[PDB]
C-alpha cells in the first residue's frame, strides 16, 4: 500500500541559527503529506533527489546500507556500516551481495551516530553527499525533530539505490527474526514557513502551498491570520497544446516534369511561402525505400526550415547503387559527390514508363571521362569537347541496367513551418512565428484579401488568417485571473473559499459564478446577511457554523 506523512522532514534551512524568528525558506524539503511505504508484513529504495530514512525498532536490526548503481568494478558504489563501536564508509565501488548478511583504496571510519526511532537523511546536492542523523526513544504521530546537519562529503559517485543490512546471531529461511519498520521519503525542492521560539529551535512548520489557508499563512509570513480576504497567487490556465500553421507550391515540376536537365546544368529551386501541395500525382507514391537523418517529421512542430534546396542530375540504372556516402570509383567522382553529413532525403524511382521513345532518346547525357573531379558547386559554361560523349541506349529488349532513371537529390541548408490547428481552446498559437497564447474562436472580424492580421488597442492582435484554408480566427489571451482566499480566521476554523478573478469556470464543494469570476470552496447562499469579508463584484461572505 502507501501512507501519508504528516509532519516529517523538518530541519534548519540554512544550517545557521536564529533566535525568536519566524521565517519562510525554500530548500530540499520533504513536502507535506508525502508518500512513505509502510513495510509491515507477516526493499530497494531508489535515491531520487535525497532519501529521508526513518526506522522504528526496539533494537538495532539495521546494520547499514549499500549505496551505488551496480556496486561492481566498473560502477562506482559505496558502503556504510553503523556498528555499536564505529561507523565505516567505504566509497570504493566495492562488490556487494544481493541478500544482505554479515558474520580499492578508499576507506573511512567515524563515530557511531547512536520501540526506538532513528532518522537519517542522505542528500546528493551540488556534487556533495550530506548526512543528517537523529535518534529518539519511543496513524503516524506528529513527531518533530529539527534535524541538525552532521556530515557533508565533497565526493560525487553514482548513487541511485541502497538496501538495509541484516545480520543474525547464527545461520547457514532461518530463525524467526523481527520485522523492522522503515519509511523512505524522497526529497523534493520545496518551500516552507517556520517559527523558531525564544530559545531558538524549530517548532512549527507550514507548507507554502498545502492549502489556501496554508498559502495565506505563507503569504503573511506568520501562523495566525485574521478573518478577511487575502490575495496569494493567480490561476493561469495551462495552454493545452501548441498549434503551428504555415498561391501554389510548385512541387510538381521538381520530379514529375516531363523534361529534365543534364548533370552539368543542375537545377536548384527554393520553394516556400506557399500552401504545400504534396498531393499532385508523381508515381502514386510507391515508397518502399526511405531513411533520412537530420530531418524528422516530429520536429516540424517546433522547427521551421529556412530553405528547400533541390539538386538534379542524370545517371543510369546499374550505377545508382554506387551513388551513396562512403562509395568509391569513377562514377561518383565524375558525376556527383555526396557529403559526409548529407542532410536531406534520397529519392530514386523508375522512369521507363515516361522516358521511352520509339526512335530513341538522346537528350540524356553524362560526363564519363574527364581530367579531374568537378569542384563542389562549380559553374562551367564552356563547350570545349574532349563520339566523345555517349548517350544512353533505351531499348525494351535490353537488360534492367539499361532502363532510364531520373535521379534528384533534395537538401536542406539551415543558414517553411509546420501544419496542425485546433480551435476554441486556450492554446499556444504560432503562424510562422507570432507566438501567442489564448483562445481562438470564431471571429467577428472580416478582413481584406491582403489584410493578414488585425490588432486591438494596447498592441494585442485580434484575428489571424489561416494560411491553409484562408479563414479568420479571433484571439483572446488566455482566461486567467488571481485568487482571493476567504478565510474566517484560524481562531475560528480552517475553511477556505477561493475566488478566481474574472474567469468563467462554466467554461473552465459547491462552485458559484459571480461577476468577479469563479468562487469555489464557497457554498453560495442566497440569503441576506451583513457583509464581513467582501468577496468581490458585489458579493460577500459569512460563516455557516
Amino acid at each position: 500500500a502507501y501512507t501519508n506523512s504528516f509532519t516529517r522532514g523538518v530541519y534548519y534551512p540554512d544550517k545557521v541559527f536564529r533566535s525568536s524568528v519566524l521565517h519562510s525558506t525554500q530548500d530540499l524539503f520533504l513536502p507535506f503529506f508525502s508518500n512513505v511505504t509502510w513495510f509491515h508484513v507477516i526493499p530497494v529504495l531508489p535515491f531520487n533527489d535525497g532519501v529521508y530514512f526513518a526506522s522504528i525498532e526496539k533494537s538495532n536490526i539495521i546494520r547499514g546500507w549499500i549505496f551505488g548503481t551496480t556496486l561492481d568494478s566498473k560502477t562506482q558504489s559505496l558502503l556504510i556500516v553503523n556498528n555499536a563501536t564505529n561507523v565505516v564508509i567505504k566509497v570504493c565501488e566495492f562488490q556487494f551481495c544481493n541478500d544482505p548478511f554479515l558474520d580499492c583504496t578508499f576507506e573511512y571510519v567515524s563515530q557511531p551516530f547512536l520501540k526506538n526511532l532513528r532518522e537519517f537523511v542522505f542528500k546528493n546536492i551540488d556534487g556533495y553527499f550530506k548526512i543528517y542523523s537523529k535518534h529518539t526513544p519511543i496513524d503516524l504521530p506528529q513527531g518533530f525533530s529539527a534535524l541538525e546537519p552532521l556530515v557533508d562529503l565533497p565526493i560525487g559517485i553514482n548513487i541511485t539505490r541502497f538496501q538495509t543490512l541484516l545480520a543474525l546471531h547464527r545461520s547457514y529461511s532461518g530463525w524467526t527474526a523481527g520485522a523492522a519498520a522503515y519509511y523512505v521519503g524522497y526529497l523534493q525542492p520545496r518551500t516552507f514557513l517556520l517559527k523558531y521560539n525564544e530559545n531558538g529551535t524549530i517548532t512549527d512548520a507550514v507548507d507554502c502551498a498545502l492549502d489556501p489557508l496554508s498559502e495565506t499563512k505563507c503569504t503573511l509570513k506568520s501562523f495566525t491570520v485574521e478573518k478577511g480576504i487575502y490575495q496569494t497567487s493567480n490561476f493561469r490556465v495551462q495552454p493545452t497544446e501548441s498549434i503551428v500553421r504555415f498561391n501554389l507550391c510548385p512541387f510538381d515540376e521538381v520530379f514529375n516534369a516531363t523534361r529534365f536537365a543534364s548533370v552539368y546544368a543542375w537545377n536548384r529551386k527554393r520553394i516556400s511561402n506557399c500552401v504545400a501541395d504534396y498531393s499532385v500525382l508523381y508515381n502514386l507514391a510507391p515508397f518502399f525505400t526511405f531513411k533520412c537523418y537530420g530531418v524528422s517529421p516530429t520536429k516540424l512542430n517546433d522547427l521551421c526550415f529556412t530553405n528547400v534546396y533541390a539538386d538534379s542530375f542524370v545517371i543510369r540504372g546499374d550505377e545508382v547503387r554506387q551513388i551513396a556516402p562512403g562509395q568509391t570509383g569513377n562514377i561518383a567522382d565524375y558525376n556527383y559527390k555526396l557529403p559526409d553529413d548529407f542532410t536531406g532525403c534520397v529519392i530514386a524511382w523508375n522512369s521507363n514508363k515516361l522516358d521511352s521513345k520509339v526512335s530513341g532518346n538522346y537528350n540524356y547525357l553524362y560526363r564519363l571521362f574527364r581530367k579531374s573531379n568537378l569542384k563542389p558547386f562549380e559553374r562551367d559554361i564552356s563547350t570545349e569537347i574532349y563520339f566523345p560523349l555517349r548517350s544512353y541506349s533505351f531499348r525494351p529488349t535490353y537488360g534492367v541496367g539499361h532502363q532510364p532513371y531520373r535521379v534528384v537529390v533534395l537538401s536542406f541548408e539551415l543558414l517553411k513551418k509546420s501544419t496542425n490547428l485546433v480551435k476554441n481552446k486556450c492554446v499556444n498559437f504560432n503562424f510562422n512565428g507570432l507566438k501567442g497564447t489564448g483562445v481562438l474562436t470564431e471571429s467577428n472580424k472580416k478582413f481584406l484579401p491582403f489584410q493578414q492580421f488585425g490588432r486591438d488597442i494596447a498592441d494585442t492582435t485580434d484575428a489571424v488568417r489561416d494560411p491553409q484554408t484562408l479563414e479568420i480566427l479571433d484571439i483572446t489571451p488566455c482566461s486567467f485571473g488571481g485568487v482571493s482566499v476567504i478565510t474566517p480566521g484560524t481562531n475560528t476554523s480552517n475553511q477556505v473559499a477561493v475566488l478566481y478573478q474574472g474567469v468563467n469556470c462554466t467554461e473552465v464543494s459547491n462552485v458559484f459564478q459571480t461577476r468577479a469570476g469563479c468562487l469555489i470552496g464557497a457554498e453560495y447562499v442566497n440569503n441576506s446577511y451583513e457583509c464581513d469579508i467582501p468577496i468581490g463584484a458585489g458579493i460577500c461572505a459569512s460563516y455557516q457554523t
Epitope: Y278, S279, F288, F290, N420
Partner: antibody, heavy 121, light 111 residues
Amino acid sequence: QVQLVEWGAGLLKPSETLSLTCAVYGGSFSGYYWSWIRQPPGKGLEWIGLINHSGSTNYNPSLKSRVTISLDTSKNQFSLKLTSVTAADTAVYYCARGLGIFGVVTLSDVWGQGTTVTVSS
Amino acid sequence: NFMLTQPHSVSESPGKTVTISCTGSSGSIASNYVQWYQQRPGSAPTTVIYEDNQRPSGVPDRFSGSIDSSSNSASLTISGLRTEDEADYYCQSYDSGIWVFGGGTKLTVLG
C-alpha cells in the same frame, strides 16, 4: 491528444461489402495519412490502405480490387469500404492516423480499439 | 522474394528487458523498413515504427525498436515490461513496393 474510435456492423455474410465508420476527436486532418489496419484473429495482418487530407490514397494489391477508403472533412469522419467479403475477410478493423512521406503510414501514434467484424452464415 | 522470420517463443519475467527480431531473407534489410507490431487477444496490430528508433506522444517511451545492418536483422525491444503488454508481435517489410508480412512472434509475460 487525439482519440480514434470505430463502430459498425460486426456480423457479415458472404458476397456483400464491408462498411465501417471512424470519427475523429480533438484532431485535424492536416498533414496526416489516415489509414485502416486489418488482421484476422490468430493470424497475421493484412494492411488495408491509406488516405491523407487531399485524399491521395494507396492500397494493397490484394485489396485494391476490393477495398475503398473515403474521407469526410465536413463530418470530420473517414470510412472504409471492402467489397466481396469472404472467409478471409473475417477480422477486426480499426481506423488510425499517420505520419510519413506522401503515404508512409507507420506512426498511427495512438492505439486503436475497433470492433469485431465476423462473417457468420 | 522477401521472407520475414521471427522467433517462435520469447519469454521474459516482468521488469526485465526483452527483444524480438525479424531477420531479413532476400537482399539487404537496410533499404526496406521492418515494422514491429503487437496483437492483444482479440485485437490487431497497429503502426508505431518509422526510422526505427523514435517514440511518439500518446505511446509509452518503453517500446523501442532497432534495425542493425551488421547481421541484416531487425529488433523490437521492451525496457519497462508490464503484464498488460501480452501481445503477439509481427514484422512487416516492403518487397519492391509490395507490403509483405511475417509469421510473427507470440510474447507472453511470465505469470
